[PDB]
């Protein structure tokens, strides 16, 4: 149960959106995370270049 909850949360944060055909021939889908939608306001703080 702990693993299930942690997986759901992490997927809702870092997931990506895609669709594909499964092994049985049926659609398989993945949901896009919060970072997938936020693209305008991203910042990487650090001392190195970039």
């Amino acid at each position: 149960m702990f693993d299930y909850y942690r997986d759901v949360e992490m997927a809702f944060i870092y997931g990506r959106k895609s669709e594909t055909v499964g092994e049985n021939g049926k659609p398989e889908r993945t949901t896009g995370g919060l970072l997938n939608f936020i693209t305008t306001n991203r910042t990487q703080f650090g001392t190195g270049a970039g």
């Binding site: 499964g22 092994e23 049985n24 049926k26």
Partner: protein, 50 residues
């Protein structure tokens, strides 16, 4: 419409410690036990220190 997934599991970790024996002793001659001293009873003073 896929089937149910396989299972997985894990185990805890173990910790240990030991017991130790402590000893402290005091000794006095029987002659010194009878002698009177200004400071006080020598036998009683030693037990406090030990």
């Amino acid at each position: 419409g896929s089937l149910a997934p396989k299972s997985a599991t894990r185990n805890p970790v173990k910790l240990n410690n030991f017991c130790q024996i402590f000893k402290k002793s005091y000794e006095i001659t029987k002659t010194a036990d009878a002698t009177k001293a200004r400071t006080g009873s020598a036998l009683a003073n030693d037990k406090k220190r030990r």
